[PDB]
Amino acid sequence: SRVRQNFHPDSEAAINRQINLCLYASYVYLSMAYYFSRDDVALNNFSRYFLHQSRECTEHAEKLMRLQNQRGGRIRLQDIKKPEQDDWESGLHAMEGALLLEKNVNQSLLELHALASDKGDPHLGDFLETYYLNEQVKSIKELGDHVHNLVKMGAPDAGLAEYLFDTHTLG
Amino acid sequence: SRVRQNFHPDSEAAINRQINLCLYASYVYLSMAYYFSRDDVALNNFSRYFLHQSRECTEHAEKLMRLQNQRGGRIRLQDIKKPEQDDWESGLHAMEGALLLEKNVNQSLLELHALASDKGDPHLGDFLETYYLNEQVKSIKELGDHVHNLVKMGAPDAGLAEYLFDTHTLG
Amino acid sequence: SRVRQNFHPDSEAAINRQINLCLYASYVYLSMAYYFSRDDVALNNFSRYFLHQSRECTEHAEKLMRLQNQRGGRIRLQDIKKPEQDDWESGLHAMEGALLLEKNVNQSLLELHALASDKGDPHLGDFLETYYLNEQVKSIKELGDHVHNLVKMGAPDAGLAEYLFDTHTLG
Amino acid sequence: SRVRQNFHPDSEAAINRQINLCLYASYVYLSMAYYFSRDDVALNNFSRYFLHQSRECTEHAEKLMRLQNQRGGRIRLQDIKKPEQDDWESGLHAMEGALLLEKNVNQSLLELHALASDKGDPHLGDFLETYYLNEQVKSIKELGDHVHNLVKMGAPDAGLAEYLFDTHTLG
Amino acid sequence: SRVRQNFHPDSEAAINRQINLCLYASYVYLSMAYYFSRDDVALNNFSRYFLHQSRECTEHAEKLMRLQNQRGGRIRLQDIKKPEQDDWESGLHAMEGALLLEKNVNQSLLELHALASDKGDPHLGDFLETYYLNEQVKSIKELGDHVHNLVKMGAPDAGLAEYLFDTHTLG
Amino acid sequence: SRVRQNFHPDSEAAINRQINLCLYASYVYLSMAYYFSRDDVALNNFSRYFLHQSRECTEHAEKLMRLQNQRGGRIRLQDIKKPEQDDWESGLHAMEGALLLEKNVNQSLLELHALASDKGDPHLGDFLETYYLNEQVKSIKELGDHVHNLVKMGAPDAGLAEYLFDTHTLG
Ligand SMILES: [Au+]
Ligand SMILES: [Au+]
Ligand SMILES: [Au+]
Ligand SMILES: [Au+]
Ligand SMILES: [Au+]
Ligand SMILES: [Au+]
């Protein structure tokens, strides 16, 4: 590739893996989003919250696809695995699931950064620092805030908890 | 009638029946609307919600009266029966009553569509598809959402449930 | 009822009767409105005139339902009887029918006022004076004007009469 | 054709026939339009009314030509037959002629819909439902309204009838 | 489910299958979009064209997820399979691949419509007619137009063909 | 006819012939317009060019119908013959066909002018001079320009010719 420079085959491959992971997270959030628009759940702001989290994840994945092409790597897509559940059980359980998901995504991004460092690729390191690492920290912190409030409010069993959290925090 | 074409007498008669039904549903919703403005109920947004549902139903009935005339049928009105109750008991009970009502109205519209198909009347079939069938599905879904939230919140016996649902969801 | 004061059970019952009557008049006018949009009648401004008269009557009925609740009475709905005819025969015959209808409605409102006086209920008396009695007089006078012009013009048998009245007076 | 899918040769041929019919109706209305701008007829609003009906029909025909190409069919034009008359005799006779024309066009469209159903072509069925069937019903109803008023007014022999109908209804 | 009415388990299952298919098509188009932003392809308007086609497909899939919930069905996601190729070879080959893809998607939607008809579900039939069937026909027609022009221009081997098509048609 | 003056029966008849011819040319151009929106032709600006030429021709025909009525002649319509071909083969062949068509139309208009002169009808002569003769010359000149460029560019066999002419000249 006539543009390739300082771009290690392991980095290119790790980027392809992160693209699949970030697409998977997008898919998890889409599943969650339409769980909360079920007639027997009907928490519309939970629904909009996770839909927005889905788009953020799709944008993360496209930016990595764009990075692959900018550096002369070659995008290789894999299946996007279905989420672990279709029934996300409650607003609290979904938020806790999102938190676990974002920490796994964050672990992968951190390992991708360590690889970039090992290979002496400061462009890739800065790319992750500038667009991913702090977004992940903000996302994880926000999900932690929500989990805490939902637990403190008595979710899932206190009938008013998820309803009121839906209308006040997520509205 | 010099405009009548492909318009079966059974369809004309079924349309007259649907007009009475859609007027009845309008009357049920009007009853519900003024139940919630009682001084011993005083849920003003429940009141406005059902009043709006009443108007939607009056518009449905007028559109069917208009269809009758467009096709050369002849409108034949019948008594509009009083609702089953004047005292609708609670916000939850009214919402559940509306849901049952809308499903019966939906069943009638679906049977009217099947008649139109049997008689080869695609204008009538499309009329129902375009203005009634999806409106009924949206309406029924919304009432299901509300019923679910009210139950989850502990209505009717939890004193805060209908009050908070009134101010947050229906406001 | 913790709001009830100076509100006689006969007044409450008479109000429920007037609600049914005012809803009936609304139904009569709706029937008339869609008679004039028949392809073999097709007097669109007669149609709009009676449709407007129908809404005025629905608003009268809702205001009485509202009054019932303001005073602590309890709304009790009855069947809304179908109009005496589906075929209103001509613009003149419909106008004459409306005039008779409004005079009967006016008689009922006047009897309701006399009851309010007998029971010493000046709030109810003023309510009727402020929102019903003069509206009825304006309505009856207008219908008399129209009946007179239609007769003078030679309706129903002079072919130009209802057509020209439709376009000039009711447009 | 690399776009053709689920598109039956009988439907393609029936569409070509409907294109000719809808072009013919356009031609009939053009003939009528310039009959009423004759110095010995001079009903300018009849003229504009039928000219507008002509354009609606040209747009119907072009939409069917467009549908043919969208589905991969092949447009085959035939002669556009001259109207049955150049002298349309009166405003009433022209309106009655338009009504008969629109009912024949409507019959053809309904038969085209039944063919689409038989061939399992829901795209074609919906196309007719969405753009033709209800337009035809509105058109036929309107022509019925006009015919009725013109007859009631005493057209064609009452000298004021077509003149006044021209200025009031069609202006 | 308290909202479910006239909704057959086979329709619910077929809808889940169509959701996976429409998500797959979205994934195919995303793959194509980032193939054309490769430094050794660099047809930016091909890239934007297929990216737009990807979003249209994501919106189709979300609307079906929404329909599932409106009708009381239950969304069940499956893996989204990777596209058949990462290297789409040329602008012509990608357009031909999109055409084949859209015809397969169209076949599935048509089979879904036939199922809805068999089960007497006119809401589902109309949903497909209103939002999918004609969009598919427009899409397939457009891809056919593009394939034709690219072939006529001498793509893929004429060096100016895809470049000029990119700048003129897709810009 | 009380308006007829200096209007020769041969002129009236020749005008009726020109109306049919100008309607025919309109029909030829409509055929051409929808040939270029075929999926295996797909030259959208050729399509819009000939559609515009079709409307110009319809306006020419209506103006002659209007002239007939202004002068007291009587419009007599004949069948509009189908075009010689449905398949117009190429952009060049269609342009050459339009050129031949416009020259025949021009010959007819010139012969109509010579008739007007012979009959001493300067109103008819000026009508043709003012609205037809120079429009025909502009039209024929433009078609000649296009034919020349298309030939010089190597149409129909050079794949880029009609495509580039479509986007640059006709856009
Ligand atoms: Au991500
Ligand atoms: Au209704
Ligand atoms: Au009243
Ligand atoms: Au037509
Ligand atoms: Au799709
Ligand atoms: Au012409």
Numbering used by the authors:
A (entry chain A), B (entry chain A), C (entry chain A), D (entry chain A), E (entry chain A), F (entry chain A): 6 to 176
What does the paper say about this structure?
It is a nearly spherical 24-subunits-protein with exterior diameter about 12 nm and a hollow cavity of 8 nm. Like human H-chain ferritin, the ferroxidase centers of HuFtMt are composed of A and B iron binding sites of conserved amino acid ligands His65, Glu27, Glu107, Glu61 and Glu62.
Therefore, to create specific Au ions binding site at the ferroxidase center, we re-designed these centers by genetically introducing cysteine residues as potential coordination ligands into them under help of the YASARA software in two steps. Differently, the crystal structure of 2Cys-ΔC shows that one gold atom is coordinated by Cys27 and Cys62 in a linear geometry, occupying the original A site of the ferroxidase site, and this Au ion was buried within four α-helix bundle of each subunit. There are totally 24 Au ions occurring at each protein shell as shown in Fig. 2A3. Thus, these crystal structures validated our re-design of the ferroxidase center in atomic detail, thereby supporting the utility of the intrasubunit interface strategy for creating the specific Au binding sites. In contrast, the 2Cys-ΔC-templated Au NCs emit a weak fluorescence under the same experimental condition, which has an UV–vis absorbance at 390 nm, which is the characteristic surface plasmon resonance peak of small metal NCs.
